[PDB]
Amino acid sequence: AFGITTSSSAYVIDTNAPNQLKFTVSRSSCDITSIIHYGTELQYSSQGSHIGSGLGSATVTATQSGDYIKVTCVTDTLTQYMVVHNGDPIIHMATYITAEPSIGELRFIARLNSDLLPNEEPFGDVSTTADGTAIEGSDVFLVGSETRSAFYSSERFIDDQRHCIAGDAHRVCMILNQYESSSGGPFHRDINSNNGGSYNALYWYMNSGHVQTESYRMGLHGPYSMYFSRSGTPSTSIDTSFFADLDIKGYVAASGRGKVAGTASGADSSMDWVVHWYNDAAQYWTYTSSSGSFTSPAMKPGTYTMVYYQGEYAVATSSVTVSAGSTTTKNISGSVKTGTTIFKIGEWDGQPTGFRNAANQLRMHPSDSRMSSWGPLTYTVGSSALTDFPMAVFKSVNNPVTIKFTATSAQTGAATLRIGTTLSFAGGRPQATINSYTGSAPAAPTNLDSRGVTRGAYRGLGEVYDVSIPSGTIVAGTNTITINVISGSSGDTYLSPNFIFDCVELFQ
């Protein structure tokens, strides 16, 4: 029967789902300590499923409102909610914070039976670290000769509405339709799953210090929903609007939200376009249609910074105000401006897309034997393919990058060498030499204090470095550009100072 069973130690919640879903919540800790799906225990027996590494102690209550049951767990600065609807095999959740947890990240982890749920979806075993030996920190491993990490399960949040773990008789999915309280914008990615050897972990990292570019946001995180299937795969269309009737701290219902709608224009139409709104309270985003039209998700009222990207490259920024129950009409327009191009390596998309090892890097470590050589490599304009240009340069692996190009007599005037990047590590930034002319040494970028290129990530502050080349420095015939990564810091191999490339363009 749909309902709550009360004992001194626990509430047992029965969803009355057709294929059976019951779970046990500790009244002392709020840990989920048992999950029974289709007659089978799925919860790891030695450690609970919970926020963080457990709330430890919480004040727990459970109540039924019609066809809904709500479990509430209160701690000093965090309240955790679990909500179920009669007939649905889903644990809906939301997490209300008034301070960031002491660990400096906010996550939910389901620790589930890895014999029953060995697989990770959609990326497969690249985040399976079971039987692995650590090669970096305690989070990148060698399993046989293949590099593995929880991080290689990651996906851009704008594209991460569903991720799962599964076996041949059960599947468990996170369905994530509300990232408004997360940090780092639409292109932030984070750990999604990890079969680590004792259990298979399924996560939602609401926020973290993993290549974090923004401050944390307080308030209600989610809703998020954990769906239990036999062999089906659930749709991401899951109504959670019933949260409006359950006195959920921080919950702002549809009626309390407005929207922004309009058309973006001017950017590179061969790229996907994204519009992004943010302020200290909330962040939102949407893809535009091919015509540039967009409508934001339902937004909390307030004033927001509004950004228009082609790929992940920002072409315009504006400001807009939203009020409840109304649509603010707001267009946005811009384009990437350079000049008359002598050569261009890559595209202005805020990514290392097309470069050597870029596709591999999302799903394996740079030391993996399956990576192509990092270099030093010499890219000759007009002969080399883009996959011969390294996606990143590391002070102590493949420094420097050399570019050879031919110029005509009509191209020997003044020019600008533009070195666009995505993400730095340990102070890495470029210093360029063009023939016998040496550009100034830029200052160190802002330190994000996080590994990234070794953990399947590339979305940083997108620093761009221009070098002014005087007329008569380019010569008719062959020319040589050397890009060195400079930094006062040091490191072993891929932890040496480094940056990931976006695009290198020489224009007049």
Binding region for Ca ion (CB under 5 A): 346-347, 349, 351, 502-503
Comparing CB distances to Ca ion, the nearer of 101 and 350 is 350
* DSSP element (H, E) containing 359: helix 358-361
> Cβ closer to Ca ion: 166 or 500?
500
**Minimum distance from residue 308 beta carbon to Ca ion (Å):** 17
Element (H, E) at 214: none
Q: Which one, 180 or 349, has the nearer CB to Ca ion?
A: 349
Q: Cβ of residue 334: shortest distance to Ca ion, in angstroms?
A: 17
Q: What's the CA dihedral at 19, 243, 176, 311 to 10 degrees?
A: 150
* Least distance CB 353 / Ca ion (angstroms): 5
What is the rounded distance in angstroms from the CA atom of residue 40 to the CA atom of residue 417?
Answer: 62
Min dist. Cβ of residue 265 to Ca ion (A): 21
* Closer by beta carbon to Ca ion, 160 or else 349: 349
Nearer to Ca ion, 121 or 347 (CB): 347
- The verdict on whether omega for the bond into residue 352 sits within 30 degrees of 0, i.e. cis, is no
With H, G, I as helix, E, B as strand and everything else as coil, classify residue 398: coil
SS3 67: coil
| Closest distance to Ca ion from the beta carbon of 118 (Å) | 36
Closer residue to Ca ion, CB minimum distance, 257 or 429: 429
β-bridge partners, 61: 72
Measured from the CB atom, the residue of 108 and 313 that comes closer to Ca ion is 313
Are 296 and 277 in contact by the 8 Å Cβ rule? The answer is: yes
Question: How far apart are alpha carbons 145 and 148 in whole angstroms?
Answer: 10
Minimum CB distance to Ca ion, residue 508 (Å):
21
Which letter does DSSP use for residue 106 in this model? E
Q: Checking DSSP bridges between strand 378-380 and strand 401-407, what pairing results, if any?
A: parallel
- Dihedral sign (CA 103, 108, 113, 118): negative
Q: Which is nearer to Ca ion, 167 or 462 (CB)?
A: 462
Q: How distant, in Å, are the alpha carbons of 68, 88, 425, 447 from that of 37?
A: 19, 12, 44, 46
- Residue 321 sits at the vertex; the CA angle it makes with 317 and 327, to the nearest 5 degrees, is 110
Smallest gap from residue 189 Cβ to Ca ion (A): 17
* Gyration radius of the chain over CA positions: 25
C-beta of 359: minimal distance to Ca ion in Å?
13
Q: In whole angstroms, give the CA distance from residue 340 to residue 482.
A: 21
3-state SS, 64-109, equals EECCEEEEEEECCCEEEEEEEECCCCEEEEEEEECCCCCCCCEEEE
Q: Which is nearer to Ca ion, 347 or 463 (CB)?
A: 347
Residue 213 CB coordination number (10 Å): 17
